[PDB]
Amino acid sequence: GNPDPNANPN
């Protein structure tokens, strides 16, 4: 469920 670290964090 956790997104990739480089995904959109906003």
Epitope: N8, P9, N10
Partner: antibody, heavy 125, light 107 residues
Framework: QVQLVESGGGVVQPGRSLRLSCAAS????????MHWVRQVPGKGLEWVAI????????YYADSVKGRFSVSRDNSENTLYLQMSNLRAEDTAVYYC??????????????????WGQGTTVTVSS | DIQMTQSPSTLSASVGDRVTITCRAS??????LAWFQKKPGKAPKLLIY???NLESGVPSRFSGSGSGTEFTLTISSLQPDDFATYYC????????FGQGTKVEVKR
């Protein structure tokens, strides 16, 4: 318009703790991911941690994992970095950095845009 | 991780020269590459994003190009305030910086 001001830096003995803070203004803090990045003397710049806009996701560099913790309070527009078990290798200028904000959500992966002025942490006996 | 190497590490140029800095990645990162300016005692400044898209606040004399593993930063007409250290940063897999390139004045 984006303004970031870090505080908390100073001298800490090896093995002790220290908390850094970062005050944000000029943008909607609760809608932006935030980074911690440091500039180590001798080395270069080094990513430390990222935190999602709502704090639901946190990722850490392997060199600080288990020792550092990143948090935020969107009601106070403040980013925190709790540092524990500090060693002399953590001496650096610590920068609060906003993740790149793209109103159009064009691209698949995200970097950083606005850096703070930085606060200096000196871990030494 | 992904390793970022810049060339040259240092360069001497005059006011008005065209300067090109190259940055190579140990793996393919498409266009997930940014360029930062930095001066001693000052915060870094984002110059180029997505390898070639100039930030709106940055003067048009700064230009970026490249995809995959080879990337270049260009300053068409070096102005007095352009002498600084420049860093490339990949943001494909976590975030790693190049070793920085110092632009010195030639006299």
């Amino acid at each position: 318009q984006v303004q970031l001001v870090e505080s908390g830096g100073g001298v800490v003995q090896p093995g002790r703790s220290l908390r850094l803070s970062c005050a944000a203004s000029g943008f909607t803090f609760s809608n932006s991911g935030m980074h911690w990045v440091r500039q180590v003397p001798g080395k270069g710049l080094e990513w430390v941690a990222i935190i999602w806009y709502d704090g639901s996701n946190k990722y850490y560099a392997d060199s600080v994992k288990g020792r550092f913790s990143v948090s935020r309070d969107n009601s106070e527009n403040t980013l925190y970095l709790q540092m524990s078990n500090l060693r002399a290798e953590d001496t650096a200028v610590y920068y609060c950095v906003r993740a790149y904000f793209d109103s159009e959500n064009l691209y698949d992966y995200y970097g950083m845009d606005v850096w703070g002025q930085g606060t200096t942490v000196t871990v030494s006996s | 991780d992904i390793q970022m190497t810049q060339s040259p590490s240092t360069l001497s140029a005059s006011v008005g020269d065209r300067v090109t800095i190259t940055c190579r990645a140990s793996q393919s990162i498409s266009r997930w590459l940014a360029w930062f300016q930095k001066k001693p005692g000052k915060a870094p400044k984002l110059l180029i994003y997505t390898a070639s898209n100039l930030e709106s606040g940055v003067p048009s004399r700064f230009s970026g190009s490249g995809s995959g593993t080879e990337f270049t930063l260009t300053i068409s007409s070096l102005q007095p305030d352009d002498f600084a250290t420049y860093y490339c940063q990949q943001y494909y897999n976590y975030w790693t910086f190049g070793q920085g390139t110092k632009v010195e004045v030639k006299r």
